[PDB]
Every structure is written in C-alpha cells, then in structure tokens.
Amino acid sequence: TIGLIQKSSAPEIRQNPFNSDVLNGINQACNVRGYSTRMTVSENSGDLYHEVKTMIQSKSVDGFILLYSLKDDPIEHLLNEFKVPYLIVGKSLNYENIIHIDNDNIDAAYQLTQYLYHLGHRHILFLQESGHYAVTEDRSVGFKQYCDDVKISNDCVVIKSMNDLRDFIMPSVIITSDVMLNMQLLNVLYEYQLRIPEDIQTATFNTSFLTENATPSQTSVNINPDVLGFTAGNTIIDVLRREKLISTQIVERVSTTKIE
Amino acid sequence: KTLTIGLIQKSSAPEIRQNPFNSDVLNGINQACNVRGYSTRMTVSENSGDLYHEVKTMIQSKSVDGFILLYSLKDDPIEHLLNEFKVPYLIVGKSLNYENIIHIDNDNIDAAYQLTQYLYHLGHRHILFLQESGHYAVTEDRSVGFKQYCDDVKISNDCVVIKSMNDLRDFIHMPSVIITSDVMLNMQLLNVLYEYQLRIPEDIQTATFNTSFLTENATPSQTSVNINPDVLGFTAGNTIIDVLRNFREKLISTQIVERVSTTKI
C-alpha cells in the first residue's frame, strides 16, 4: 500500500483536475504491480500531521508520495524522523537527496509569458493563489523573470478570496497560477462584463476539461499530470525494495489572440 | 482477506474522471475505509471492453475483497460478471439488473421533479432538459422526474440527448431556462451560450445537478441540486464494509442551491 498525501482534502483542492490526473497516473502504475493505495483525508495541516503519523505508527502503509511541496513542511520532518520511504511530486526544498518528480514550473511560466509577449502583450497581470506552496512560487518567479528580461511591468498579486478578487477587479491579459483561481477570475470578469478576448485575455496553468470548456476556452500550459503520476508511482515502487522533470506545452485556445 | 475495496468507475477518461462527483464520493469512501482499516484500488480502463477484463483479472487475482460500482447501467456486463463469481458488491445508484443487490443513491427522479418545480415557481413555462449521452440510470432518472413534473402542470417537456460539443452547438421562441443533467455537460452549455453571446440570467437561465466548486464558480454561478456525494461515499464505504464483516437500500437527501443563473421571470 502506498500513501498519497494531499495538502488538503477540502473541495477546492480535491476537485482540482490536477489531483484526478495525477492519481490516475499513480493507479496505472500501482495496479500493474500489485499495490493498493491510500489517500489522506485531513482538511488542515494540523490533522494531516497526526493523520500521517497515525498512518506511520499503525504501519498501514509501506511508503508515501507527497502530492505537493512546501518549504519547512512539518510532514517532511515527520517522515524523515521516522525514516519512512517517500518522494515528492514537486520541488524538494527541505531535505537533500530526496527523489522528486516535477515540471520546470519557472520555465513553464517564463514560456507562457513569452508567448503572450509575442502576441503583442505589454501589460500583463499575474494572479497568484494564496499559500506558500513551491509550485505557485515557481510560476510567479518565472513570470517576473521574463518581465525583467524584456523590461515590462511585473504586477504579481496574491488573491486571498473571491471577494478580494472582486475588489481587485488595465492589463491586456491576465495569467492565473492555477485553473481553480482561473474559474473564479472568469466568473468575476463576466460579472463586470469584460468580454474575453475582446475586452481582455486570460491564460492559466494545467490543461483539462475545465480549461477546454471554460467560458471561453482557456489558453493554458499542459503540465502532463498523467505522466507525473505514472512516474511517481513507478519510482516509489522501485524504492521499496534524483530529479525527474516532465515537459510542458502551451495549448492555444479562445482566451488569447494577437493584439495590436 | 486483502482488506481492500475495488472501486469500479465507468471510465477513467478525463471528462469522466475529472467530474467533481468522483472526487467527492471517493473522499467519502476514503473517510469510511481509513477508519476501519481498509485499502483501496480503482479501475483505470477507459472503455467497457477493457474494464470487464480488468475487473475479471481483479476477481481472479483475488486482489480485492468487495466492490463498489460508481455507476449503474442497464444490462451491465460487469454486474453479470460480479454475480457469476459471487463477489460482494454494492451500487452507488439505482439497482436495475439483479434484485437484492445493495445500493446507495439519491432519489434522482424526485430531485429533478423538485428542480423543475422550483423553476416553474419562478415563472418558467418553456423548459429544456439537456441529457448527457449514455444509458446510465442516474441520467434516465433525472429525465424522468423532469417529464413527470411537466406532465403534472401540462407544459412542454423538450428533452434532448447531447452526444458531443458539436451536437450541443448545432442544437444551439427559445426556452427561458435550460437544465443540464450534469455539471460537465453544463460547463459545455455555458461555453456555447457565451460564444453565442446569450447572457445569463438576462437572456436565458440555466440549472444543473451536483453542486460543487465548478457550479459555485461557473460563469455565472449556477443554481444547482446538491446531491451530497461525500455522504453517498461515506455511506457506500461503511455499507460495503458492513457486508464484508460479520438486503438494504439507502437514499441520500438532495437540496436546491440557488445562485445567479436563475431568477424570477
């Protein structure tokens, strides 16, 4: 049995297409090798720590896959204190020599902004999801890195809530660090009658049914989560008796278009 | 004695697997199994042909103790297979093939009846029901409830099956409100309505089933039926463990969640 540690089981997190795809990848690998799986169910970090600890002491799992990366994560200290095997789907920031499978999110973001720049965009706004997770930080860094390279504004705003998003409401295109925040952005733009792409363009990360069928279809970065999961599943099985990066691609849709 | 429960999803294809209903029911099942000491295994097949042999391989490999079908389909080969091998299982949905098979579900017929009634009370008289393709029981039940209400108030009962996005667009006096049988079909409808510049709720109204982040944050927010999938999952998880340890049919309530997509006409 492999333990799958999600940062949270809360609706806004578990319902993210990313979780579904990564899990599908892992199940594909584990099924073929006679392994079952177990997912954490805690909604907050405090419970997650004691849930994962209860998991380690009850020996209900053989190894873990950490489905997120967080600087100074109590969970990683826990796993290391009890010498349990594990790997991360994201960047390794707390312990050296830990196996981690991830996309080069800084590059993914650098490339996305570059693509938009070449469409004619000069005023780009990056909406960052709340929290201090490595992936969000990596994407904001890539965005600001490109903006500094071509000397354009680098407005980066952290959205704490739907109301904070409304009050924040001009850039020619808005990039959101994740699809769930993107859905909220489209909602607010529709409320304020800002037509896409006529009045404003938008782009986000993680291609899925949600971006393809959004209102309107969203240009996004495909991070191939299926591959991340399959790789994570196989690699941890290998461990139980290194940095692997998965490529990304830009999927052009209705939300972006050449501007003059 | 694998202390594992096999989860049979109709398909692992994006459009299906990404449906928030799946994430919610799984979380519910997981809450039940983790506290009682059970593991989990979910199918990965993307079509019925592969799923059958995957399930049979699971049964023969003795890799699981019991199953939970996360769907219900008339004349499902999977159910014939499960009964032939006498393996314990329960259905999250309406039991249609073998009597005495335990099933946990919402009263989808009444949930649709109530949504249509709610819309009728707002002043709607020309309601269009969009049905997702497939012969799945849940979808048939919702179309049935809609038609029963239209029959009780003697109004139009236009019910159309959507095979794909293309058929949706082609499908396009227009109805005053459109109900979709599920959130994913609903996302596609909102996409088409936006393309055709039909504002919601000003130009037309919409409503769907399965309240979730996707309905609460749709464009615009969607009035929807809350079917409490986490409870369906928790209930299904505890019920299959009860059977494996040591028939029954359980229904989970539904409530209408009112949002921006609907308003008095």
TrEMBL record, chain B:
CDD domains: PBP1_MalR-like
Keyword flag Transcription: yes
UniProt-recorded Gene Ontology molecular function terms: DNA-binding transcription factor activity; transcription cis-regulatory region binding
Keywords: DNA-binding, Transcription, Transcription regulation
The Transcriptional regulator LacI/GalR-like sensor domain, residue ranges: 117-262
Residues spanning the membrane: none
Matches recorded under InterPro entries: LacI/GalR-like_sensor, Peripla_BP_I
Gene3D superfamilies xref list: 3.40.50.2300
Domain of life of the native organism: Bacteria
SUPFAM superfamilies linked: Periplasmic binding protein-like I
PANTHER family referenced in this protein's UniProt entry, alphabetically: HTH-TYPE TRANSCRIPTIONAL REGULATOR GALS, LACI-RELATED TRANSCRIPTIONAL REPRESSOR
Name of the protein described by the UniProt record: Transcriptional regulator LacI/GalR-like sensor domain-containing protein
Species this chain originates from: Staphylococcus haemolyticus (strain JCSC1435)
